[PDB]
Write a protein that holds these residues in place. Structure first.
Motif, short mmCIF file in Angstrom:
data_model
loop_
_atom_site.label_atom_id
_atom_site.label_comp_id
_atom_site.label_asym_id
_atom_site.label_seq_id
_atom_site.Cartn_x
_atom_site.Cartn_y
_atom_site.Cartn_z
N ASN A 2 0.82 -1.20 0.00
CA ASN A 2 0.00 0.00 0.00
C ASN A 2 0.86 1.26 0.00
O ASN A 2 0.36 2.37 -0.25
CB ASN A 2 -0.99 -0.01 1.18
CG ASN A 2 -0.30 -0.08 2.51
OD1 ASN A 2 0.51 -0.98 2.76
ND2 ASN A 2 -0.63 0.86 3.40
N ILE A 3 2.16 1.07 0.22
CA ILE A 3 3.11 2.17 0.14
C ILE A 3 3.65 2.24 -1.27
O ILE A 3 4.28 1.27 -1.74
CB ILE A 3 4.28 2.01 1.11
CG1 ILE A 3 3.78 1.89 2.54
CG2 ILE A 3 5.26 3.16 0.94
CD1 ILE A 3 4.87 1.54 3.54
N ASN A 52 -1.98 6.31 10.93
CA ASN A 52 -2.77 7.17 10.09
C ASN A 52 -1.87 7.94 9.08
O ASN A 52 -2.29 8.94 8.47
CB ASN A 52 -3.51 8.11 11.07
CG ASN A 52 -4.64 8.89 10.45
OD1 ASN A 52 -5.32 8.42 9.55
ND2 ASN A 52 -4.85 10.09 10.95
N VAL A 53 -0.62 7.50 8.93
CA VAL A 53 0.42 8.28 8.24
C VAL A 53 0.40 8.14 6.70
O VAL A 53 0.69 7.08 6.14
CB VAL A 53 1.84 7.90 8.74
CG1 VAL A 53 2.90 8.55 7.90
CG2 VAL A 53 2.02 8.29 10.21
N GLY A 80 17.77 1.79 6.99
CA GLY A 80 17.15 2.99 7.51
C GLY A 80 16.02 3.50 6.64
O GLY A 80 14.97 3.90 7.14
N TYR A 81 16.23 3.46 5.33
CA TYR A 81 15.23 3.91 4.38
C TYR A 81 13.97 3.05 4.52
O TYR A 81 12.84 3.57 4.55
CB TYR A 81 15.80 3.86 2.96
CG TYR A 81 14.79 4.18 1.89
CD1 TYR A 81 14.39 5.48 1.63
CD2 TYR A 81 14.19 3.16 1.16
CE1 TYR A 81 13.43 5.76 0.66
CE2 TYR A 81 13.25 3.42 0.20
CZ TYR A 81 12.87 4.72 -0.06
OH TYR A 81 11.92 4.96 -1.04
N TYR A 82 14.15 1.75 4.63
CA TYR A 82 13.01 0.86 4.78
C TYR A 82 12.27 1.08 6.11
O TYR A 82 11.04 1.05 6.17
CB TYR A 82 13.47 -0.60 4.68
CG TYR A 82 12.34 -1.55 4.81
CD1 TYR A 82 11.55 -1.88 3.71
CD2 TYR A 82 12.02 -2.10 6.05
CE1 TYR A 82 10.49 -2.77 3.83
CE2 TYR A 82 10.96 -2.97 6.18
CZ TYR A 82 10.21 -3.30 5.08
OH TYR A 82 9.18 -4.18 5.25
N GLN A 83 13.01 1.31 7.19
CA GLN A 83 12.33 1.48 8.47
C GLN A 83 11.61 2.83 8.42
O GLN A 83 10.47 2.95 8.87
CB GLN A 83 13.28 1.42 9.67
CG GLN A 83 12.67 2.15 10.89
CD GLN A 83 13.63 2.42 12.05
OE1 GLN A 83 14.76 2.88 11.85
NE2 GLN A 83 13.15 2.18 13.27
N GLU A 84 12.26 3.83 7.84
CA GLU A 84 11.66 5.14 7.82
C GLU A 84 10.41 5.21 6.92
O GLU A 84 9.34 5.54 7.39
CB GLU A 84 12.68 6.19 7.40
CG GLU A 84 13.60 6.59 8.51
CD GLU A 84 14.95 7.05 8.01
OE1 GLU A 84 15.02 7.57 6.88
OE2 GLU A 84 15.96 6.87 8.74
N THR A 85 10.52 4.84 5.65
CA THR A 85 9.36 4.79 4.80
C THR A 85 8.28 3.88 5.39
O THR A 85 7.08 4.08 5.16
CB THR A 85 9.69 4.29 3.38
OG1 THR A 85 10.16 2.94 3.46
CG2 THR A 85 10.73 5.15 2.70
N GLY A 86 8.72 2.85 6.11
CA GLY A 86 7.81 1.85 6.64
C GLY A 86 6.89 2.36 7.71
O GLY A 86 5.97 1.67 8.11
N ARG A 87 7.12 3.57 8.19
CA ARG A 87 6.24 4.14 9.21
C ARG A 87 4.98 4.66 8.61
O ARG A 87 4.09 5.15 9.32
CB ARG A 87 6.94 5.26 9.97
CG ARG A 87 8.11 4.82 10.78
CD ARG A 87 8.38 5.79 11.87
NE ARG A 87 9.14 5.18 12.95
CZ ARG A 87 10.47 5.19 13.00
NH1 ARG A 87 11.15 5.76 12.02
NH2 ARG A 87 11.10 4.63 14.02
N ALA A 88 4.87 4.51 7.30
CA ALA A 88 3.74 5.03 6.58
C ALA A 88 2.73 3.93 6.40
O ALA A 88 3.08 2.77 6.50
CB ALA A 88 4.17 5.58 5.25
N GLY A 89 1.47 4.31 6.24
CA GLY A 89 0.41 3.41 5.86
C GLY A 89 0.22 2.21 6.76
O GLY A 89 -0.04 1.12 6.28
N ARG A 90 0.29 2.42 8.06
CA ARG A 90 0.18 1.30 8.98
C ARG A 90 -1.29 0.99 9.20
O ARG A 90 -1.65 0.13 10.00
CB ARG A 90 0.91 1.57 10.30
CG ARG A 90 2.42 1.58 10.13
CD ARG A 90 3.07 0.22 10.27
NE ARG A 90 4.52 0.38 10.30
CZ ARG A 90 5.39 -0.55 10.70
NH1 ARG A 90 4.94 -1.71 11.17
NH2 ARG A 90 6.69 -0.30 10.68
N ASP A 91 -2.15 1.73 8.50
CA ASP A 91 -3.58 1.43 8.52
C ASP A 91 -4.01 0.68 7.25
O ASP A 91 -5.21 0.51 7.01
CB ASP A 91 -4.39 2.70 8.67
CG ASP A 91 -4.14 3.70 7.52
OD1 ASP A 91 -3.28 3.43 6.62
OD2 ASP A 91 -4.81 4.76 7.52
#
Ligand SMILES: [Zn+2]
Length: 500
Positions: free
Chosen positions: A204-205, A292-293, A307-318
């Protein structure tokens, strides 16, 4: 039987069945096997040793450095019904003595233990006379000079396979660097063990990387055009870029906040809550939750793919659509390579940081689907292009060098996967260097088959094959054809560079 696992699965966790490869994993460690588990972080990854620890008689012994984090893994667990405890040198000698008693009396389901405690000769002796169900080595990557935080402790865990051959070992990691995956196998003897890769994908990202050009202008246009009032995180490299960007955003009517290692520990908790509890707040940070990001913006290069994966990964947790949007230029790569050069780091850290960057740049430059390249770094192979990345949706113009890639891959094969880029290039060009004549390479049938191109293109083709893992280097500048080489050689895969 496999179904007692399921009874515990939902009488404790509340999931009605395993997800992805976890059924396979839990069965392999419960039947006494060994395992290599590579997963994104989450209580699903913990399931892979916690559940087997419940299935096999005796206590699961979990090795982890996060002793500061530790004390809420037992707190989490001790209300589900599970008995667990911590053993480390932050403890008083009586307290240390009663976890030991509890261990010896078969009273724990899980024992979390710092490496420092575990490797002590005394501690290994207790284990020999305690009812142990298994060893789980969490964050296994630490054994490696490569993958993440090396630790001198961690490469001694050699010893679990020695003193306890009969007990199962499962090693789990979230950073699956390909040189690191190889090094974990070596330390914990899992070369012969199954290796499990659960998906890192976050469908979804949508992933986007593009060229920096008035990055604050580009960003605002992005935010207004595509995410007008949504919560997002904007990552910047320095504490000063966070401050200034944060108030530049406020200036244009965007509710932005700064969040960095710096100022006050109250505001920082204050910023978390404003982000966590309100809508449409944007946080600007350097490196450091919300379901809700809607976007993650990178206005500078991250320090690594991890780092890039963990950072972008904070998105779309819904589970809903979110965009990862990054611009980099010019000066970003230059500034980075200069700091590596003026760094006072040790030899292997300079070596690691240079491939970290090479990996990242190779992802930034993808001529085919970004997602495929990203997931490959973590050992996941996505067969087909995703259709939700900027490369997939807006295909760049490509040079096809598939024919040259094949020539190069054969060249390194008929010479035994040991010569260096320059030597290979000699063979390809049909140059009778004396290094060539010394090995007879001057009349292999492949000699000079590449006379069509000049020295510069081959070296380029070779870097490209190296970067994408069709070749493996760290033979000391000798290039080995990897397994992945069949892709170009027999299975029709193409080598494409950006037209640039
Ligand atoms: Zn794609």
């Amino acid at each position: 039987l496999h179904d007692r696992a399921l009874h515990l699965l939902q009488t404790i966790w509340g999931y009605p069945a395993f997800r992805g490869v976890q059924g396979e994993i839990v069965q392999q460690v419960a039947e006494g096997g060994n395992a290599l588990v590579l997963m994104p972080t989450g209580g699903g990854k913990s399931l892979c040793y916690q559940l087997p620890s419940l299935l096999r008689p005796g206590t699961g012994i979990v090795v982890s450095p996060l002793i500061a984090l530790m004390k809420d893994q037992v707190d989490t667990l001790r209300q589900n019904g599970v008995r667990a405890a911590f053993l480390n040198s932050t403890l008083l000698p009586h307290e240390a003595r009663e976890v030991e008693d509890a261990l010896l009396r078969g009273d724990l389901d899980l024992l979390y233990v710092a490496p420092e405690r575990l490797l002590m000769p005394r501690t290994l002796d207790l284990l020999e006379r305690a009812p142990v169900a298994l060893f789980a080595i969490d964050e296994a990557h630490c054994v490696s000079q490569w993958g993440h935080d090396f630790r001198p402790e961690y490469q001694q865990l050699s010893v679990l396979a020695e003193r306890f051959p009969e007990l199962p070992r499962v090693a789990l990691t979230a950073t699956a660097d390909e040189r690191t995956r190889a090094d974990i196998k070596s330390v914990l003897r899992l070369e012969d063990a199954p290796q499990f890769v659960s998906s890192f994908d976050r469908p979804n990202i949508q992933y986007r990387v593009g060229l920096k050009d008035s990055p604050k202008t580009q960003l605002l246009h992005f935010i207004r055009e595509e995410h007008p009032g949504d919560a997002g995180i904007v990552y910047c490299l320095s504490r000063k870029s966070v401050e200034e960007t944060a108030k530049w955003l406020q200036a244009q009517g965007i509710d932005a906040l700064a969040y960095h290692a710096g100022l006050s520990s109250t505001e920082r908790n204050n910023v978390q809550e404003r982000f966590l509890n309100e809508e449409g707040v944007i946080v600007c940070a350097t490196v450091a939750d919300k379901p809700n990001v809607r976007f993650v913006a990178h206005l500078d290069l991250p320090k690594s793919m991890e780092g890039y994966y963990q950072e972008t990964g904070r998105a779309g947790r819904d589970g809903l659509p979110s965009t990862a949007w990054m611009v980099y230029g010019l000066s970003d790569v230059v500034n980075v390579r200069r700091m590596l050069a003026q760094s006072d780091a040790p030899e292997e850290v300079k070596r690691v940081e240079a491939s970290k960057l090479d990996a990242l740049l190779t992802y930034c430059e993808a001529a085919t689907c970004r997602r495929q390249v990203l997931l490959h770094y973590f050992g996941e192979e996505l067969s087909e292009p995703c259709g939700n990345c900027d490369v997939c949706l807006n295909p760049p113009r490509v040079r096809d060098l598939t024919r040259e890639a094949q020539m190069a891959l054969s060249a390194t094969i008929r010479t035994g996967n040991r010569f260096g880029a320059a030597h290979l290039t000699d063979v390809l060009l049909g140059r009778e260097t004396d290094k060539v004549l010394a090995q007879g390479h001057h009349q292999l049938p492949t000699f000079g088959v590449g006379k069509e191109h000049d020295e510069k293109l081959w070296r380029s083709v070779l870097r490209q094959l190296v970067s994408l893992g069709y070749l493996s280097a760290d033979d000391h500048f000798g290039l080995r054809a990897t397994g992945k080489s069949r892709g170009i050689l027999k299975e029709g895969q193409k080598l494409l560079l950006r037209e640039d």
